[PDB]
Amino acid sequence: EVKLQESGGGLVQPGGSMKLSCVASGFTFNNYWMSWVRQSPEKGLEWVAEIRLNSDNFATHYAESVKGKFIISRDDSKSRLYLQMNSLRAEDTGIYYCVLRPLFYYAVDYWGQGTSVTVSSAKTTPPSVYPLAPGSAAQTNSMVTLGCLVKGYFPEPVTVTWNSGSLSSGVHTFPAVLQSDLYTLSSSVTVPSTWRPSETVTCNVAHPASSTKVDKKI
């Protein structure tokens, strides 16, 4: 049993400081251990830190390239587990997973879901969605393809639903790209055979650094 929710992610000019968090629910497990693991495409997964509660208040342990830089801390009274990282660099960009395991003889540890941290020198920029109705004829059998192009936004976390997330059947969002400290990504829905009174179809969009566009087809 568990519920781990980590907050605090974002993006920092390099050198910037932060303070990831995650708060434990369900637990009051006399004796556990907790730690932060991180994953970016460059490195795959890596155990970064770990405070430790066998019953001695605090014992910590870090690694090859994190010590000096971050410090695990957490107080049960507070229910939370804080992780301040200083002197950040490119290398450290990734998703930080917050995983806690209890020292029962046996069972398994738990994990949460993460948050992006982006060390970049650049600056935020909102997205420019665009609709993608068809052209002059979508033909490959009876059904149609519509889509959304999302050109030019910057910190990486983003989310693209199709019509308030109500219609999934054949959505294909695509892994974003980067050419010039800017991303462009686009999705696609193939609805039914009848070009419909497209009137309903709206491509909603979410972007944490201040936006939420929306859209329509021709």
């Binding site: 155990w47 109705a133 490959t140 294909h172 892994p175």
Partner: protein, 215 residues
């Protein structure tokens, strides 16, 4: 540094096969501190196996783990389509806790021709500034594919941003996008805008294209 490595990197499994990705330490640790994680595209490491043989809450029982010494393996009785993740091993013996390169499985299917699509620029965008002819290419299989955008013969490959998809879950096919992106002066500047697509399944390419429906 303490090292686990996974034999092998990528696999290919027909539904109903028996898979076994091995994992192996650099120094003899003990069975009972080698955990196995499963991660499915678009989400976070999902505790799969704890102990060297314990399954976690939910792990289907067609899955099997075992080892002792330096070589631990994982085996799936009857590969099915939701095993298509990337699995990784992990060491919680001595700090530092290290992990495997992670083995990527994927589920085998019958070759299938994609559903090409080519939407031209969007009203909005053009009269903002730049303008890009976006061609989707959906539901193909396998992912060993290549593509080009030729406008009036001379393939004009300069802005082409090809982006792919990890396997479907319903159908289990790849799908990809690519964007030709141009300064509008280069845009009025031509007409035959074609997206030819070449993939193992039809020695006569696919070529959805647009001349002019707009202006």
């Amino acid at each position: 540094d303490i090292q686990l490595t996974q034999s092998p990197a990528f696999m290919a499994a027909s539904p109903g096969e028996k898979v076994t990705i091995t994992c192996s330490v650099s120094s003899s640790i003990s069975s009972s501190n080698l955990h196995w994680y499963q991660q499915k595209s678009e989400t976070s490491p999902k505790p799969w196996i704890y102990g060297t043989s314990n399954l976690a809450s939910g792990v289907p029982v067609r899955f099997s783990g075992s080892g002792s010494g330096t070589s631990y393996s994982l085996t799936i009785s009857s590969m099915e389509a939701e095993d298509a993740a990337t699995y990784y091993c992990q060491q919680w013996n001595s700090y530092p806790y290290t992990f495997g390169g992670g083995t990527k499985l994927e589920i085998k299917r019958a070759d299938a021709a994609p559903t090409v699509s080519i939407f031209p620029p969007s009203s909005e965008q053009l009269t903002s500034g730049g303008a890009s002819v976006v061609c989707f290419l959906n539901n193909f299989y396998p992912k060993d594919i290549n593509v080009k955008w030729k406008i009036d013969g001379s393939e004009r490959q300069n802005g082409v941003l090809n982006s792919w998809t990890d396997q479907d879950s319903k159908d289990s096919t790849y799908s990809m996008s690519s964007t030709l992106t141009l300064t509008k002066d280069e845009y009025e500047r031509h007409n035959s805008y074609t997206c030819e697509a070449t993939h193992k399944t039809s020695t006569s390419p696919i070529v959805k294209s647009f001349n002019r429906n707009e202006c």
